Write a protein that binds this ligand. Structure first.
Ligand SMILES: NC(=O)c1ccc[n+]([C@@H]2O[C@H](COP(=O)([O-])OP(=O)(O)OC[C@H]3O[C@@H](n4cnc5c(N)ncnc54)[C@H](OP(=O)(O)O)[C@@H]3O)[C@@H](O)[C@H]2O)c1
Ligand SMILES: NC(=O)c1ccc[n+]([C@@H]2O[C@H](COP(=O)([O-])OP(=O)(O)OC[C@H]3O[C@@H](n4cnc5c(N)ncnc54)[C@H](OP(=O)(O)O)[C@@H]3O)[C@@H](O)[C@H]2O)c1
Lengths: 381, 381
């Protein structure tokens, strides 16, 4: 997927664009399942606005409320039952990546006569899915315009990504105002996640053009410049707009399907979230820099390039490796300066379960084995 | 369409990616109409490669050869008759924007019991279309990933753009090698056209984010830096790759659907091509800068921004209007430095038919009337 660029979701970006819902729903069925999280959309007033638009569209509404961060497969199965109960034609996901990922799993589960966990574990390949669209309230995992979904089995302590072109969103409404009330920590997590997709793309071997590299470096620089201002001024339209734009539309100009499918490359983060339920991007901030150090290429050209072009590392009097490692230091220091965690200790995680986590994570050049995962976990304590 | 970002075509980018045709054709029917132009694809060897892949796909091939630059509706109607005769399931356009635009009109015409010119003139809105894909051989009109098509009626001397979401290409294969033999003049025209889509986006009112502006400015600067090198080294892979990337994938990060639909904003170029059959982007090089001068906003902030940030105009001691107009001067001077035409005289066009051309062009704030069109034409003689 590294040479494939495919983003078929219709994006509508701007203030008040929830009012485009009736037009976008016109071609779909009238029985709509509205899927959302723990209540933030009611506190912001977005819920009432969505209901108002759904009434204007003449649709019959039922709801699945309470999707959890790191969405549970029990919640997926509950949504599937609601789809059968209410003869749902179309789903509307209003929330963040957990809500959208959950809606994708419901949309596919609705066409499968079995436990939705079979889709997550790739036991059943989806052959059909209900259509759905999104109203994004957190910038920005990419789920609002990609084909992947990451679901937790809390009973077995497993968290796995799966995907299907049948669960690309039909449309996604992207309004910076709808991200105003994302609290500080999840605003940080959203930006850590955005940046991580760009790193994943950049680290591909011999599949980036030089201009694509410039696009990625500029994106990273703009997130880095904007993030400290946003975290101290969370209801600022232009700051929220910058992060929403750079985390959504802009990335269609540089991210391959492989980078948008990078939910297949974070086994360690998944295993830690599977056991302790920490936010995915909190795991990224703790673990990804130590993964970069553990796997830094013996030709550190690509990370050297990022260190110099994004993190302003002065290479005079340094080896290329010193420059590359300094870039990783500056990345982690930047995330920490926003308030991101940088040790498992920050989430009250000690070394008690590192062996079990490594086993769960293990369930080309530089690929990891169990000792690699254990070493990265220990370095992150 | 200025707040909508929608590019559903699957893009496959890189050397040799014509070999992905069988995988992509798996999902479509086996009766394929292969559509191409005047023979450049046979001289380059691409024709034989495509035939080999179609055989590998088990496809039954029929051909429509000889699509002309500024494709004629007679060619469209001929393709429609072939679709009915041979029970065509899928079309494969191998060529440039004229071939792809023609294929779109055939794909929609194949579901319409009437003259395909009714679709071009918007008398008939397509309600269905055959699916199709492309192999792009000229960088890059955007037809390979947008929903529009510009067709000439050579009998009536008319050229009109039309569009429909039903004629987005399913997939497009983008290999820089397939553009190596584009001659110098059409290499120039492709880059003039690329740049003009970016200008169209940039000129939208209050619908660009600041980061989007930076993306557009950077794209323009890179084409400007790359174009003179490419025109003197046409079979250079990295130079062809830069122009193909900036003219295709990169633009999905900054162009709204309205900018990708800017075939509705070039009435004057269309009328001149309708009468004299000149290349569309030759018309752009001659007419677009004079349209910019004729319509320069009385708040020249946006064009001043382009003048300073893209064309490096030093604003010290100058008015904002002087700077904006100098930017337009620098744009036209740049296109001319590549070899693009800058006067209607360059195509042996005098003033004899300007009134007829203005009538053909006339068939919101700053919209043009006939006197406006005549003034721009006279300024361009
Ligand atoms: N499919 C992919 O490719 C992909 C990529 C990256 C990450 N992911 C996954 O996405 C999930 C993380 O998604 P996420 O970072 O967007 O966060 P999230 O888990 O969807 O939500 C995190 C928190 O943000 C709150 N929230 C969201 N929008 C809010 C708003 N406008 N105002 C106030 N609070 C708001 C939510 O509260 P409420 O519940 O009350 O609304 C929730 O508690 C992870 O499970 C990750 O594995 C998937
Ligand atoms: N749909 C839209 O939104 C949109 C946007 C912009 C422009 N347009 C339209 O696109 C058309 C212009 O398209 P275009 O600029 O791509 O050019 P084109 O009209 O498709 O082709 C121009 C010339 O380039 C030759 N050619 C193409 N690829 C070649 C290659 N690899 N090697 C050698 N020769 C090659 C062609 O020769 P052969 O015929 O022998 O192959 C032809 O003579 C216009 O009619 C314009 O109105 C549409």
């Amino acid at each position: 997927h590294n040479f494939t660029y495919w983003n078929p979701t219709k994006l509508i970006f701007g203030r008040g664009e929830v009012e485009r819902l009736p037009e976008e729903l016109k071609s779909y069925g009238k029985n709509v399942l509205l899927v959302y999280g723990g209540g933030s959309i009611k506190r912001s007033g977005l819920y009432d606005q969505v209901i108002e638009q759904l009434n204007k569209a003449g649709v019959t509404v039922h709801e699945l409320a309470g999707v959890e961060p790191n969405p549970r497969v029990s919640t997926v199965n509950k949504g599937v039952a609601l789809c059968k109960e209410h003869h749902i034609d179309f789903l509307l996901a209003v929330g963040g990546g957990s809500v959208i990922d959950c809606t994708k799993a419901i949309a596919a589960g609705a066409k499968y006569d079995g436990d939705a966990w079979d889709i997550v574990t790739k036991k059943h390949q989806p052959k059909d899915a209900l259509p759905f669209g999104t109203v994004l309230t957190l910038a920005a995992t990419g789920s609002e315009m990609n084909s992947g979904s990451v679901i937790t089995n809390w009973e077995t302590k497993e968290k796995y990504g799966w995907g299907s072109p049948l669960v690309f969103p039909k449309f996604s409404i992207l309004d910076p105002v709808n991200t105003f009330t994302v609290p500080k920590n999840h605003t940080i997590y959203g930006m850590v996640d955005m940046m991580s997709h760009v790193f994943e793309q950049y680290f591909h071997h011999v599949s980036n053009t030089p201009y694509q590299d410039r696009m990625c470096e500029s994106l990273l620089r703009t997130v880095i410049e904007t993030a400290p201002k946003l975290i101290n001024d969370l209801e600022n339209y232009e700051l929220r707009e910058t992060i929403l734009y750079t985390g959504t539309i802009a990335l269609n100009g540089m991210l391959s399907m492989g980078a948008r499918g990078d939910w297949a490359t974070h086994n360690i983060e998944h295993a830690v979230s599977a056991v302790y339920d920490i936010p995915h991007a909190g795991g990224l901030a703790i673990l990804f820099p130590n993964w970069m150090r553990h796997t830094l290429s013996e030709n550190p050209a690509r990370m050297k390039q990022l260190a110099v072009r994004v993190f302003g590392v002065e290479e005079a009097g340094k080896t290329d490796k010193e420059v590359a490692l300094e870039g990783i230091d500056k990345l982690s220091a930047f995330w920490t300066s926003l308030g991101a965690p940088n040790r498992l200790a920050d989430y009250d995680i000690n070394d008690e379960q590192l062996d079990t986590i490594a086993d769960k994570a293990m369930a080309q050049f530089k690929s990891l084995n169990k000792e690699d995962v254990l070493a990265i976990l220990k370095a992150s304590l």
